[PDB]
Amino acid sequence: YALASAELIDGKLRFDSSDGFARAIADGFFFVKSPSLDLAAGDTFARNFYLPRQEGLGAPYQGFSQWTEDRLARREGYFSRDVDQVEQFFLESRFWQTVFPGPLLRQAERMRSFSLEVLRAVLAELDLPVELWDEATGRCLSMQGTYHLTFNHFRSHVRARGLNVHKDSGWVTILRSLEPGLEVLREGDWLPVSPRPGEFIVNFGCAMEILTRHSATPVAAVAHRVQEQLPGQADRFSYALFVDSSLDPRTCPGLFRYLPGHGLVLEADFEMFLNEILHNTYQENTQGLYLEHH
Ligand SMILES: C[C@@H](CCO)[C@@H]1NC(=O)[C@H](CC(C)(C)O)NC1=O
Ligand SMILES: O=C(O)CCC(=O)C(=O)O
Numbered sequence: 001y002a003l004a005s006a007e008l009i010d011g012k013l014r015f016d017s018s019d020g021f022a023r024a025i026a027d028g029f030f031f032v033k034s035p036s037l038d039l040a041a042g043d044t045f046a047r048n049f050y051l052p053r054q055e056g057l058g059a060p061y062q063g064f065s066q067w068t069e070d071r072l073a074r075r076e077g078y079f080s081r082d083v084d085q086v087e088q089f090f091l092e093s094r095f096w097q098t099v100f101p102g103p104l105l106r107q108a109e110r111m112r113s114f115s116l117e118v119l120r121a122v123l124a125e126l127d128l129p130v131e132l133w134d135e136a137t138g139r140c141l142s143m144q145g146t147y148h149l150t151f152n153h154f155r156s157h158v159r160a161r162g163l164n165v166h167k168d169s170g171w172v173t174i175l176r177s178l179e180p181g182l183e184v185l186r187e188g189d190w191l192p193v194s195p196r197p198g199e200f201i202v203n204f205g206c207a208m209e210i211l212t213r214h215s216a217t218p219v220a221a222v223a224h225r226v227q228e229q230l231p232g233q234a235d236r237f238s239y240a241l242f243v244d245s246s247l248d249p250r251t252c253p254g255l256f257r258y259l260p261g262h263g264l265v266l267e268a269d270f271e272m273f274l275n276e277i278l279h280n281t282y283q284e285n286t287q288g289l290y291l292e293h294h
């Protein structure tokens with residue numbers, strides 16, 4: 001099975017098959033053509049952030065193990081996992097200017113703009129009235145949301161799963177990758193997904209699934225994982241722009257569900273939801289999934 005694919009053209013997702021969008025929201029995953037988007041700075045960071053900083057050209061992209069939660073905020077910065085191959089760097093948008101080199105800041109901003117264009121184009125196809133969009137998606141459309149550029153370095157010397165089964169937490173994720181390894185759950189079976197040059201992989205997160213579950217057009221967020229990587233040639237990396245609701249509780253009170261004819265119902269505390277699913281992603285015998293309520 002091949003995922004649907006689209007081009008973003010003036011706020012409109014044009015899929016390359018008549019059933020493309022229908023398949024995308026059933027599959028939880030689809031491809032989108034990259035606009036003119038230089039990826040060199042992110043690729044450099046993805047190959048260097050975990051290395052010790054040494055004098056030279058690579059130095060500004062190295063040594064980021066020094067950026068931990070105490071210098072940023074909870075859930076931010078560098079993490080080495082015990083029972084996953086990934087070592088990771090998470091960074092929310094409010095820290096990008098302080099922490100990222102200039103070229104990576106600019107790439108992050110361009111990926112953020114593109115990701116929100118993708119989100120608006122998806123919402124435009126759903127039975128969700130525009131007057132509710134800003135509140136319903138956690139104020140991320142008015143630039144008060146939670147935007148991470150997050151990097152995965154798959155340490156092939158670690159004998160463990162590559163990245164545990166999980167759902168992403170938020171609205172859309174725009175994923176930059178080069179190699180096989182991603183598998184998505186489809187009709188009860190694990191489907192390998194390979195990246196495509198000049199394209200990003202897009203997927204929906206839990207917030208999208210919760211918002212639309214009881215609407216006329218429900219959208220799936222689907223479980224996915226990365227296979228254990230074995231040694232030999234460059235380590236696998238990936239990185240992605242994750243779009244999430246605001247984490248400030250006076251800006252966004254949590255995750256909503258839309259009930260047509262009634263309005264938005266506040267279903268879940270988002271920070272609690274996020275803290276739980278994040279922790280469960282990286283333990284030995286749990287998974288990054290959630291139990292649907294009601
Ligand atoms: C909100 C933020 C996570 C918390 O900081 C964001 N959401 C996600 O779902 C993933 C988490 C992952 C699957 C990599 O564990 N990545 C992110 O950057
Ligand atoms: O590395 C990949 O292909 C997937 C990464 C992923 O799912 C994530 O970071 O949430």
Ligand SMILES: [Fe+3]
Binds near residue numbers: 167168224
């Ligand atoms: Fe993911």
